[PDB]
Every structure is written in structure tokens, then in C-alpha cells.
């Protein structure tokens, strides 16, 4: 995308989202990041929406194939699950490469740095969902380390109702439950996050209240599933 203007790539990413063309959206946003400038709040959301949708579809297909393969246990189901897995890993590696070159290192404000470190934890978590080899423990620890750094900044720099802080805690709680085999840590994190946000809702405008309560409901939905 090197020959297209940054502003045109952003415009086309927004069009691609409207047209439900998320692979295109992710390619446009990759091109925008590679221009080398920092991203605004709105642009960070376009980057996350694009890749979350692409990898979400891959994850769903991998789970369908993995279930068939496990019920089966010719080479075709395994081969095709491996093909989908390799493509998923390649998209995660691409996102992680954008974060490492050079989004995280140039992010100084708490909102941008927490956003990118949450993404880093998420894409290592997606790698961990399909990992089995000699690096699986290391992939899990890479997710944990990214989420932990994001948590440390968020607790120092953001109020307990901040939607980025809340979504980070939600996703790190999912990591604890589904990846790290730490359901008690998952439940504790979700409950403490929910309660501390509840106690800060009185400070918020109607529109901020709506955002914080939406994510608090996601925390509650998980606690209901886990308890």
C-alpha cells in the first residue's frame, strides 16, 4: 500500500468496514501503520476492528476443524486444520510485528500504550489457543507479560471506569480462565474490576456511563458463566 496516501488508506478502511470487507480493512490499516506516524484514537479502533474480525473468523474455522479432527481420532482433516492454523498464525505475527515496529515504542500516553499492549496480549493469546510445541509455555508467558504491563499502567493512569482499562481487564480475565488454567484468578479479576467500576459510575456523564456499563455487563456475563 506504499503508493497510497495515508488519508486515502484510512478512508478506504472505513468504507471496507461498511462493506463488511474485513480482509481489505486490515490491509488498508496495515498500510496506514506502515506510513510511520502515530495513530489517533479513531485510527487505533479501525486497526483493532479489522484484525479482530479477520482472526475471529480464522479462530472460528479452526475450532470447527479441530472438533472434526478430534472426533476422527486419511490425512485431509489434519492437513486442512494445519493450513487454517498456519494462516491464523501468520495474521497474528503480522499484528504483533506492527505493534513491535513501531507502535508500542512510540506510544507515550497511557491511552495509546495500554491499547497497544492489550492488543499484544490478545494476539499472543490467539497464538496460545493453537499452540502445542516447545514454545507454548513461552507464548503464554508473552501474553501474560503484555497484559500485566498494560494493567500496571492502567491502574496508575486511568480511572476504574475507563473503557480501555475495563476491556483490558475483561480480556486478561479470559486469558486467566481459558489459557492459563487459573479460573480463580479470572473470577477475582472480573469481580474486583466490576466492583471498582460500579463505585466510580457516579462521576460519569450519560455517554461515558453507557460505555462503562456496557463492558461491566460483559464482565458480569462471564462471572455468571464461571460461577
Amino acid at each position: 500500500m506504499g503508493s497510497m496516501e495515508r488519508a486515502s488508506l484510512i478512508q478506504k478502511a472505513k468504507l471496507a468496514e461498511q462493506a463488511e470487507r474485513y480482509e481489505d480493512m486490515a490491509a488498508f490499516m496495515k498500510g496506514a501503520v506502515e506510513k510511520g506516524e502515530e495513530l489517533s484514537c479513531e485510527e487505533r479502533n479501525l486497526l483493532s476492528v479489522a484484525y479482530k474480525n479477520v482472526v475471529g473468523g480464522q479462530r472460528a474455522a479452526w475450532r470447527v476443524l479441530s472438533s472434526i479432527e478430534q472426533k476422527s481420532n486419511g490425512p485431509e482433516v489434519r492437513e486442512y486444520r494445519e493450513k487454517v492454523e498456519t494462516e491464523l498464525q501468520g495474521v497474528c505475527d503480522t499484528v504483533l510485528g506492527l505493534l513491535d515496529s513501531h507502535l508500542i515504542k512510540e506510544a507515550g500516553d497511557a491511552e495509546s500504550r495500554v491499547f497497544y499492549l492489550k492488543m499484544k496480549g490478545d494476539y499472543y493469546r490467539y497464538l496460545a489457543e493453537v499452540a502445542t510445541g516447545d514454545d507454548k509455555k513461552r507464548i503464554i508467558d508473552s501474553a501474560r507479560s503484555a497484559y500485566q504491563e498494560a494493567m500496571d499502567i492502567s491502574k496508575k493512569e486511568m480511572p476504574p471506569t475507563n473503557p480501555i482499562r475495563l476491556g483490558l481487564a475483561l480480556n486478561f480475565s479470559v486469558f486467566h480462565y481459558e489459557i492459563a488454567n487459573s479460573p480463580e484468578e479470572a473470577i477475582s479479576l472480573a469481580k474486583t474490576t466490576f466492583d471498582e467500576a460500579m463505585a466510580d459510575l457516579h462521576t460519569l456523564s450519560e455517554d461515558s456511563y453507557k460505555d462503562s456499563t456496557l463492558i461491566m455487563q460483559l464482565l458480569r456475563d462471564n462471572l455468571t458463566l464461571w460461577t
Binding site: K52, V174, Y177, I215, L218, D221, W226
Partner: peptide, 9 residues
Amino acid sequence: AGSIPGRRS
């Protein structure tokens, strides 16, 4: 268990 969605919807 659900993680955060890309958009509010």
C-alpha cells in the same frame, strides 16, 4: 466466555 468486541454493537 466473551472478550471485548471490536465495536459497541
